[PDB]
Design a protein around this ligand. Structure first.
Ligand SMILES: *[C@@H]1O[C@H](CO)[C@@H](O[C@@H]2O[C@H](CO)[C@@H](O[C@@H]3O[C@H](CO)[C@@H](O)[C@H](O)[C@@H]3O)[C@H](O)[C@H]2NC(C)=O)[C@H](O)[C@H]1NC(C)=O
Ligand SMILES: *[C@@H]1O[C@H](CO)[C@@H](O)[C@H](O)[C@H]1NC(C)=O
Ligand SMILES: *[C@@H]1O[C@H](CO)[C@@H](O)[C@H](O)[C@H]1NC(C)=O
Ligand SMILES: *[C@@H]1O[C@H](CO)[C@@H](O)[C@H](O)[C@H]1NC(C)=O
Ligand SMILES: [Cl-]
Ligand SMILES: [Cl-]
Ligand SMILES: [Cl-]
Ligand SMILES: [Cl-]
Ligand SMILES: [Cl-]
Ligand SMILES: [Cl-]
Ligand SMILES: [Cl-]
Ligand SMILES: [Cl-]
Ligand code: NA
Lengths: 170, 217, 210
C-alpha cells in the first residue's frame, strides 16, 4: 500500500493535479465464472455525460475511467446507472472522499495507494450491496480505443492518456 | 434498411483461429450497440459479447474471455469478430445483431444472414455412392451417399423425372467426422424389371458429381 | 445472472390449434420471444413482455403474470412451426420445438432391408440399411440383430419430415460393420416395432442368399 506511478503517455506536465470524484465502470455480462462479478473502467459510452451531470462535473472536464473535479457524495458512495442489471448501460460511482491524482512532469502521474485502495474497498462494499453474495472484482478495460483503455484527461488544452493498469487489478 | 451483411461460412480445425465480419448498412453505424450471438446445434443461443462503435468499447462474456476479440472500422461500418483457439465445440452459426432501439440493446429485431463455422478435424472429402439394390407388391431401391464432408449433397432420381415416392433422408454425422446419407424410392416391381433408375449425386463443396445406376441384384 | 426456465421443450401439434410456450425468469426485466425457422436467422416475435413486434400476425400474443411469461399462438400457419426462445437481457432459455403433426389414421411401415453392396465391401467397409417407409405416427423402434445378437450403438437412425402429400414419415437406420466383422456372422435382421404392426416385423436376409 504505497504510492502508485501511472505511466501517462504524452508526458503530462508537472502542474496537472486533479481531485478524483467518481468512477465510470462496466459490469461484465454473461454467466459469472466462479461466482464473481467483474467491473472494468468505462468511458461512459451512451450515457457518459448523464453520469457527469449527476456528479456535478463541469462541462470543461472531459475524462475517462476516473471522474475529476466533481462533487463528492455526502455520507456514502452513490451508485447510479440507467440500469444495473443491464450490462450495456455503464455504471456511475460517486465517491464520498476524493483521491488526488498529481502529475510530476516526468512521464508519470501519481495516486496514493493508501487513499486509493481505501476508496476501492468502499466502492466494492457498496457494489456488494447491489450485487449480493458475489465476490466483487476490478480489472482493466477488456478492449477499445486508447481513450477508453486509459484514463484520458486534458490539461492546459492538451489531451493525455494514463495507463490505469495499477488502479484496477485488485 | 436495418441491413447487416455478414461474411461467408468458414471451415476450421481444432486449434485454428477465425475472423468473420459484418457490415452494417441502413442506419447510423455508431449510434447502436452491436452484439455477436452464436446458435449451436441443440444448445440455447449464447451471447458472445457486444461492441459500441463510438469509442469501440467491447464487453465479452466471461466464459470466452481470452479467446474472443471484437473490433470495428467506423470508416467502412464493419464490425469484426475474432475467436482464437477453436474446438469441436465451436461448430455453430454466428450472428451480428442490433437492437430495435439504440436506447435498449437486448431487443434484437435485426439479425444478420448468418455465418456458419464448422470446426472438425476432417478436411473435405467427396462422397462414395453405393447402390441399395431392391433384391426383389411394390419394391424399393436407393443410393447411399457415404463418407463425405462437409454438408450438403443433392440427390435426384432419373435427372429429375422420377419424384413420386422418393425419400432423401437427413444426413447423419458418423463417428469418423464425415456424413452419411440415404436416398431411396419405391416403385412397382414389374416396372423395376423393365424401367431403369439412376440416382445423381452432387457434392458441390468438393466438385464431386456422380450418377449411379441402381440395378437389381 | 438470470435463470430463465423454459417449458415444455417438445410440442407436436396439427395446424390451427393453440400453442402455448412459457418461461420463468428469476430477475425482473423486459422479456422477448424469438422465432427460429429451421435454416433461417431468428425472428423477433414479442418484446417488452407482450408488445407484438413489427410485422407479426395478431395471432401471436404474449402474456405476463409475475415471473411467469406465456407465448400464445393460435391458428398455427405452415410457417410458424420452428423453435422459440425467450430472452431477458443477455440470457436465453432452453427453448421449445414446435413441430407440425397432421393427425390421420395409423398406417404401418414398409420395412425393407438392403445388404452392403459388393463395391462397398471391396472398399473395406460394410453398411446395412433398414428402411421403415411411409408410416404414421413418427414413434417407431428399430432394433438391429445379427446372429440373434441385439445391436445397440452401431445403428444410426435418420427420419424425414411430414410428407406433405400423405402426411407419413419415412425412416432409414444404417448399421455399419467392418468387412471382417461382416464376413464373420451370417443372418442379418432388422426388427421393427411400430404400433401399426400387430407384432414386431423382422425383415432379415441371410448372407450369401441370391
Ligand atoms: C399461461 O398459460 C397457462 C395455460 O393455460 C395458464 O395457466 C392456467 O391458469 C388458469 C388460471 O385461471 C387455470 O384455469 C383455472 O383452473 C382452475 C380449475 O379448477 C379454476 O381455478 C379456474 O376456474 C380455471 O379453470 C388453468 O388451470 C391454467 N392452465 C391449465 C392448463 O390448467 C396461464 O393463466 C397463462 N397465462 C399466464 C400464466 O400468465
Ligand atoms: C480541476 O482540474 C484541474 C486539472 O484538470 C486542476 O488544475 C484543478 O485544481 C481542479 N480543480 C479543483 C477544485 O480541484
Ligand atoms: C483538490 O486537490 C488539490 C491538490 O490536488 C488540493 O490542494 C485542494 O485542496 C483539493 N480541493 C478539494 C475541494 O478537494
Ligand atoms: C498498461 O501497463 C501495463 C504495465 O505497465 C501493461 O502490461 C499494459 O499492457 C498497459 N496497458 C495499455 C492499454 O497500454
Ligand atoms: Cl472537489
Ligand atoms: Cl484493442
Ligand atoms: Cl501507456
Ligand atoms: Cl443448453
Ligand atoms: Cl453448422
Ligand atoms: Cl463412387
Ligand atoms: Cl442415413
Ligand atoms: Cl418426404
Ligand atoms: Na459385430
Amino acid at each position: 500500500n504505497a504510492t502508485i506511478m501511472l505511466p501517462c503517455r504524452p508526458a503530462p506536465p508537472p502542474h496537472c493535479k486533479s481531485n478524483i470524484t467518481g468512477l465510470l465502470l462496466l459490469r461484465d455480462g454473461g454467466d459469472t465464472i466462479n461466482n464473481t462479478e467483474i467491473f472494468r473502467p468505462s468511458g461512459g459510452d451512451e450515457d457518459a455525460q448523464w453520469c457527469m451531470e449527476r456528479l456535478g462535473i463541469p462541462s470543461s472536464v472531459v475524462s475517462t475511467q476516473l471522474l475529476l473535479n466533481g462533487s463528492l457524495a455526502e455520507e456514502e458512495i452513490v451508485i447510479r446507472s440507467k440500469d444495473l442489471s443491464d450490462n450495456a448501460k455503464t455504471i456511475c460511482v460517486q465517491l464520498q472522499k476524493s483521491v488526488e491524482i498529481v502529475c510530476t512532469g516526468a512521464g508519470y502521474c501519481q495516486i496514493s495507494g493508501r487513499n486509493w485502495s481505501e476508496a476501492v474497498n468502499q466502492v466494492k462494499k457498496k457494489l456488494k450491496e447491489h450485487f449480493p453474495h458475489k465476490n466483487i472484482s476490478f480489472q482493466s478495460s477488456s478492449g477499445g480505443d486508447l481513450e477508453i483503455t486509459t484514463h484520458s484527461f486534458n490539461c492546459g488544452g492538451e489531451f493525455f492518456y494514463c495507463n490505469t493498469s495499477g488502479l484496477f487489478q485488485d | 434498411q436495418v441491413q447487416l451483411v455478414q461474411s461467408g461460412g468458414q471451415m476450421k480445425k481444432p486449434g485454428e483461429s477465425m475472423r468473420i465480419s459484418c457490415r452494417a448498412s441502413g442506419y447510423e453505424f455508431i449510434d447502436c450497440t452491436l452484439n455477436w450471438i452464436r446458435l449451436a446445434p441443440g444448445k440455447r443461443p449464447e451471447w458472445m459479447g457486444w461492441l459500441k462503435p463510438r469509442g469501440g468499447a467491447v464487453n465479452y462474456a466471461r466464459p470466452l474471455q481470452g479467446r474472443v476479440t471484437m473490433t470495428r472500422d467506423v470508416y467502412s461500418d464493419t464490425a469484426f469478430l475474432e475467436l482464437r483457439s477453436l474446438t469441436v465445440d465451436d461448430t455453430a452459426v454466428y450472428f451480428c445483431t442490433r437492437g430495435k432501439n439504440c436506447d435498449y440493446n437486448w431487443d434484437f429485431e435485426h439479425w444478420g444472414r448468418g455465418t456458419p463455422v464448422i470446426v472438425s478435424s476432417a478436411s473435405t472429402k467427396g462422397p462414395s455412392v453405393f447402390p441399395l439394390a431392391p433384391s426383389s407388391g411394390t419394391a424399393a431401391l436407393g443410393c447411399l451417399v457415404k463418407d463425405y464432408f462437409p454438408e450438403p449433397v443433392t440427390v435426384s432420381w432419373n435427372s429429375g423425372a422420377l419424384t413420386s415416392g422418393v425419400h432423401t433422408f437427413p444426413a447423419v454425422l458418423q463417428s469418423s467426422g464425415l456424413y452419411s446419407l440415404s436416398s431411396v424410392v419405391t416403385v412397382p416391381s414389374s416396372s423395376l424389371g423393365t424401367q431403369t433408375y439412376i440416382c445423381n449425386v452432387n457434392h458441390k463443396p468438393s466438385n464431386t458429381k456422380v450418377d449411379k445406376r441402381v440395378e437389381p441384384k | 445472472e438470470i435463470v430463465l426456465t423454459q417449458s415444455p421443450g417438445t410440442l407436436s401439434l396439427s395446424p390451427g390449434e393453440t400453442a402455448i410456450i412459457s418461461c420463468r425468469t428469476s430477475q425482473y426485466g423486459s422479456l422477448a420471444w424469438y422465432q427460429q425457422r429451421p435454416g433461417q436467422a431468428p425472428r423477433l416475435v414479442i418484446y417488452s413482455g407482450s408488445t407484438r413486434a413489427a410485422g407479426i400476425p395478431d395471432r401471436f400474443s404474449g402474456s405476463r403474470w409475475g415471473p411467469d411469461y406465456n407465448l400464445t399462438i393460435s391458428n398455427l400457419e405452415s410457417g410458424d412451426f420452428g423453435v422459440y426462445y425467450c430472452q431477458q437481457y443477455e440470457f436465453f432459455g432452453q427453448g421449445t420445438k414446435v413441430q407440425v403433426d397432421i393427425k390421420r389414421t395409423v398406417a404401418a411401415p414398409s420395412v425393407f432391408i438392403f445388404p452392403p453392396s459388393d463395391e462397398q465391401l471391396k472398399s473395406g467397409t460394410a453398411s446395412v440399411v433398414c428402411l421403415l417407409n411411409n408410416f404414421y405416427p413418427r414413434e417407431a423402434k428399430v432394433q438391429w440383430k445379427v446372429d440373434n445378437a441385439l445391436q445397440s450403438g452401431n445403428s444410426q437412425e435418420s427420419v424425414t419430415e411430414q410428407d406433405s402429400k400423405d402426411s407419413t414419415y419415412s425412416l432409414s437406420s444404417t448399421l455399419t460393420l467392418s468387412k471382417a466383422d461382416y464376413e464373420k456372422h451370417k443372418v442379418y435382421a432388422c426388427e421393427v416395432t411400430h404400433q401399426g404392426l400387430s407384432s414386431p416385423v423382422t425383415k432379415s436376409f441371410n448372407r450369401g442368399e441370391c
